[PDB]
Amino acid sequence: LDKYSEALKDAQEKLELAEKKATDAEADVASLNRRIQLVEEELDRAQERLATALQKL
Amino acid sequence: LDKYSEALKDAQEKLELAEKKATDAEADVASLNRRIQLVEEELDRAQERLATALQKL
């Protein structure tokens, strides 16, 4: 009962931590998706500014 | 024993799933991290190309 209870408190805590890791990994997926998109948008802007600088050049 | 064994297999399944929520979220953030590294590297290369175009300008 304890082997399972212990395995459970550990599986359950590991779950809360895996769920937390998932929460954080997902928070990071979302925070990075935001950041990736921000760098993609800023990249498009750098590329547009580059096309502009190159046309001005 | 069954209550703990079941709660355990469920904590373990939830754990494997949460680990996969995290692994998939990790795969996604990792994909995104690769994208931020590549896009941000291009942001900076575009920004550097831009700085170059602007300096040349």
Side-chain angles (χ1 to χ4, degrees):
Chain A
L1 270 183
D2 288 343
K3 291 176 187 177
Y4 293 134
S5 182
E6 292 169 352
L8 174 59
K9 76 183 172 65
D10 293 340
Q12 188 65 50
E13 180 62 10
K14 287 173 184 177
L15 179 273
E16 294 304 316
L17 295 171
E19 185 67 45
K20 180 64 163 72
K21 185 169 75 176
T23 299
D24 290 343
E26 185 64 16
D28 291 342
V29 171
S31 295
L32 270 285
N33 191 48
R34 176 196 65 201
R35 290 286 300 116
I36 277 65
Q37 290 170 348
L38 289 169
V39 299
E40 288 173 350
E41 290 174 352
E42 186 63 36
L43 172 58
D44 287 345
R45 286 190 288 271
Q47 290 172 347
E48 290 166 353
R49 287 194 297 269
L50 176 58
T52 299
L54 292 171
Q55 184 61 50
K56 287 179 177 177
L57 176 57
Chain B
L1 290 174
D2 288 343
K3 291 172 187 168
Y4 291 114
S5 181
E6 291 169 353
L8 175 60
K9 77 182 172 63
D10 293 340
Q12 290 172 330
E13 183 63 20
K14 289 174 183 177
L15 174 57
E16 182 63 19
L17 178 60
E19 183 64 21
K20 290 296 192 293
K21 290 177 188 178
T23 301
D24 291 342
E26 180 62 19
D28 290 342
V29 77
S31 181
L32 288 169
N33 287 335
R34 287 189 293 274
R35 288 167 63 192
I36 201 168
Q37 290 165 352
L38 293 168
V39 174
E40 192 175 36
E41 176 66 24
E42 284 294 324
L43 185 158
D44 286 332
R45 290 170 180 175
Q47 187 63 29
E48 183 63 17
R49 282 196 295 269
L50 173 59
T52 298
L54 292 171
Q55 290 161 354
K56 287 178 175 176
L57 175 58

PDB file of all heavy atoms in Angstrom, chain B residues 3 5 12 20-21 25 31 35 37 39 49 54 56:
ATOM      1  N   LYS B   3      -6.636   1.106  -4.852  1.00  0.00           N
ATOM      2  CA  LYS B   3      -6.877   2.540  -4.921  1.00  0.00           C
ATOM      3  C   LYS B   3      -5.583   3.302  -5.179  1.00  0.00           C
ATOM      4  O   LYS B   3      -5.574   4.223  -5.995  1.00  0.00           O
ATOM      5  CB  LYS B   3      -7.534   3.012  -3.642  1.00  0.00           C
ATOM      6  CG  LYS B   3      -8.922   2.490  -3.547  1.00  0.00           C
ATOM      7  CD  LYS B   3      -9.591   2.742  -2.231  1.00  0.00           C
ATOM      8  CE  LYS B   3     -10.902   2.008  -2.241  1.00  0.00           C
ATOM      9  NZ  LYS B   3     -11.543   1.936  -0.906  1.00  0.00           N
ATOM     10  N   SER B   5      -2.724   1.875  -6.449  1.00  0.00           N
ATOM     11  CA  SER B   5      -2.170   1.323  -7.677  1.00  0.00           C
ATOM     12  C   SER B   5      -2.833   1.996  -8.846  1.00  0.00           C
ATOM     13  O   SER B   5      -2.204   2.245  -9.868  1.00  0.00           O
ATOM     14  CB  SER B   5      -2.374  -0.167  -7.771  1.00  0.00           C
ATOM     15  OG  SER B   5      -1.814  -0.674  -8.947  1.00  0.00           O
ATOM     16  N   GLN B  12       0.887   8.116 -12.975  1.00  0.00           N
ATOM     17  CA  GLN B  12       1.945   7.745 -13.892  1.00  0.00           C
ATOM     18  C   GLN B  12       1.534   7.983 -15.327  1.00  0.00           C
ATOM     19  O   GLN B  12       2.364   8.374 -16.143  1.00  0.00           O
ATOM     20  CB  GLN B  12       2.353   6.303 -13.701  1.00  0.00           C
ATOM     21  CG  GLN B  12       3.074   6.039 -12.417  1.00  0.00           C
ATOM     22  CD  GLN B  12       3.287   4.582 -12.204  1.00  0.00           C
ATOM     23  OE1 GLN B  12       2.491   3.756 -12.660  1.00  0.00           O
ATOM     24  NE2 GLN B  12       4.357   4.232 -11.508  1.00  0.00           N
ATOM     25  N   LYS B  20       4.770  14.279 -21.631  1.00  0.00           N
ATOM     26  CA  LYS B  20       4.610  14.491 -23.048  1.00  0.00           C
ATOM     27  C   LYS B  20       3.986  15.846 -23.323  1.00  0.00           C
ATOM     28  O   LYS B  20       4.283  16.464 -24.330  1.00  0.00           O
ATOM     29  CB  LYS B  20       3.849  13.361 -23.728  1.00  0.00           C
ATOM     30  CG  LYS B  20       4.634  12.029 -23.800  1.00  0.00           C
ATOM     31  CD  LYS B  20       5.913  12.162 -24.666  1.00  0.00           C
ATOM     32  CE  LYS B  20       6.546  10.806 -24.993  1.00  0.00           C
ATOM     33  NZ  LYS B  20       7.098  10.114 -23.784  1.00  0.00           N
ATOM     34  N   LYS B  21       3.166  16.382 -22.435  1.00  0.00           N
ATOM     35  CA  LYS B  21       2.654  17.704 -22.706  1.00  0.00           C
ATOM     36  C   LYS B  21       3.858  18.601 -22.713  1.00  0.00           C
ATOM     37  O   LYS B  21       3.977  19.461 -23.572  1.00  0.00           O
ATOM     38  CB  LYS B  21       1.707  18.216 -21.631  1.00  0.00           C
ATOM     39  CG  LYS B  21       0.379  17.567 -21.529  1.00  0.00           C
ATOM     40  CD  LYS B  21      -0.377  18.165 -20.360  1.00  0.00           C
ATOM     41  CE  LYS B  21      -1.649  17.420 -20.076  1.00  0.00           C
ATOM     42  NZ  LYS B  21      -2.345  17.976 -18.899  1.00  0.00           N
ATOM     43  N   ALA B  25       5.445  20.279 -25.685  1.00  0.00           N
ATOM     44  CA  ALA B  25       5.600  21.700 -25.480  1.00  0.00           C
ATOM     45  C   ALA B  25       7.070  22.007 -25.577  1.00  0.00           C
ATOM     46  O   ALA B  25       7.453  23.071 -26.034  1.00  0.00           O
ATOM     47  CB  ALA B  25       5.041  22.157 -24.156  1.00  0.00           C
ATOM     48  N   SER B  31      11.398  23.932 -31.109  1.00  0.00           N
ATOM     49  CA  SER B  31      11.238  24.292 -32.502  1.00  0.00           C
ATOM     50  C   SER B  31      11.267  25.786 -32.579  1.00  0.00           C
ATOM     51  O   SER B  31      11.959  26.358 -33.423  1.00  0.00           O
ATOM     52  CB  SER B  31       9.940  23.761 -33.050  1.00  0.00           C
ATOM     53  OG  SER B  31       9.798  24.095 -34.397  1.00  0.00           O
ATOM     54  N   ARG B  35      13.690  28.441 -34.140  1.00  0.00           N
ATOM     55  CA  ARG B  35      13.198  29.539 -34.936  1.00  0.00           C
ATOM     56  C   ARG B  35      13.632  30.876 -34.376  1.00  0.00           C
ATOM     57  O   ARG B  35      13.912  31.776 -35.141  1.00  0.00           O
ATOM     58  CB  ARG B  35      11.693  29.509 -35.062  1.00  0.00           C
ATOM     59  CG  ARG B  35      11.162  28.412 -35.945  1.00  0.00           C
ATOM     60  CD  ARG B  35       9.700  28.232 -35.799  1.00  0.00           C
ATOM     61  NE  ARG B  35       8.929  29.411 -36.212  1.00  0.00           N
ATOM     62  CZ  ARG B  35       7.612  29.600 -35.958  1.00  0.00           C
ATOM     63  NH1 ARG B  35       6.914  28.696 -35.303  1.00  0.00           N
ATOM     64  NH2 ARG B  35       7.007  30.700 -36.364  1.00  0.00           N
ATOM     65  N   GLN B  37      16.326  31.440 -32.730  1.00  0.00           N
ATOM     66  CA  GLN B  37      17.730  31.548 -32.984  1.00  0.00           C
ATOM     67  C   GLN B  37      17.997  31.827 -34.442  1.00  0.00           C
ATOM     68  O   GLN B  37      18.818  32.673 -34.754  1.00  0.00           O
ATOM     69  CB  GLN B  37      18.387  30.249 -32.574  1.00  0.00           C
ATOM     70  CG  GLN B  37      18.397  30.026 -31.079  1.00  0.00           C
ATOM     71  CD  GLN B  37      18.718  28.598 -30.725  1.00  0.00           C
ATOM     72  OE1 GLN B  37      18.787  27.743 -31.617  1.00  0.00           O
ATOM     73  NE2 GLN B  37      18.901  28.327 -29.440  1.00  0.00           N
ATOM     74  N   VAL B  39      15.712  33.048 -36.740  1.00  0.00           N
ATOM     75  CA  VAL B  39      15.048  34.239 -37.177  1.00  0.00           C
ATOM     76  C   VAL B  39      15.697  35.427 -36.569  1.00  0.00           C
ATOM     77  O   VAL B  39      15.891  36.401 -37.265  1.00  0.00           O
ATOM     78  CB  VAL B  39      13.573  34.237 -36.845  1.00  0.00           C
ATOM     79  CG1 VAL B  39      12.998  35.553 -37.196  1.00  0.00           C
ATOM     80  CG2 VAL B  39      12.865  33.140 -37.639  1.00  0.00           C
ATOM     81  N   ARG B  49      22.870  43.736 -42.122  1.00  0.00           N
ATOM     82  CA  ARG B  49      22.863  43.993 -43.552  1.00  0.00           C
ATOM     83  C   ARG B  49      22.309  45.398 -43.698  1.00  0.00           C
ATOM     84  O   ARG B  49      22.775  46.190 -44.518  1.00  0.00           O
ATOM     85  CB  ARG B  49      21.975  42.987 -44.280  1.00  0.00           C
ATOM     86  CG  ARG B  49      22.618  41.625 -44.482  1.00  0.00           C
ATOM     87  CD  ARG B  49      21.873  40.812 -45.527  1.00  0.00           C
ATOM     88  NE  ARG B  49      20.514  40.491 -45.105  1.00  0.00           N
ATOM     89  CZ  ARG B  49      20.178  39.393 -44.438  1.00  0.00           C
ATOM     90  NH1 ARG B  49      21.106  38.502 -44.113  1.00  0.00           N
ATOM     91  NH2 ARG B  49      18.915  39.183 -44.092  1.00  0.00           N
ATOM     92  N   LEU B  54      22.819  50.981 -44.632  1.00  0.00           N
ATOM     93  CA  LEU B  54      22.678  52.325 -44.114  1.00  0.00           C
ATOM     94  C   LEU B  54      24.009  53.015 -44.027  1.00  0.00           C
ATOM     95  O   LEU B  54      24.094  54.202 -44.305  1.00  0.00           O
ATOM     96  CB  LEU B  54      22.037  52.302 -42.739  1.00  0.00           C
ATOM     97  CG  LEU B  54      20.574  51.855 -42.675  1.00  0.00           C
ATOM     98  CD1 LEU B  54      20.198  51.696 -41.226  1.00  0.00           C
ATOM     99  CD2 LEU B  54      19.661  52.863 -43.364  1.00  0.00           C
ATOM    100  N   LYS B  56      26.504  52.183 -45.908  1.00  0.00           N
ATOM    101  CA  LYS B  56      26.811  52.345 -47.300  1.00  0.00           C
ATOM    102  C   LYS B  56      26.001  53.478 -47.825  1.00  0.00           C
ATOM    103  O   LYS B  56      26.490  54.208 -48.666  1.00  0.00           O
ATOM    104  CB  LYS B  56      26.565  51.097 -48.118  1.00  0.00           C
ATOM    105  CG  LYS B  56      27.540  49.982 -47.937  1.00  0.00           C
ATOM    106  CD  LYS B  56      27.107  48.801 -48.783  1.00  0.00           C
ATOM    107  CE  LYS B  56      28.107  47.673 -48.743  1.00  0.00           C
ATOM    108  NZ  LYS B  56      27.613  46.482 -49.498  1.00  0.00           N
TER     109      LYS B  56
END
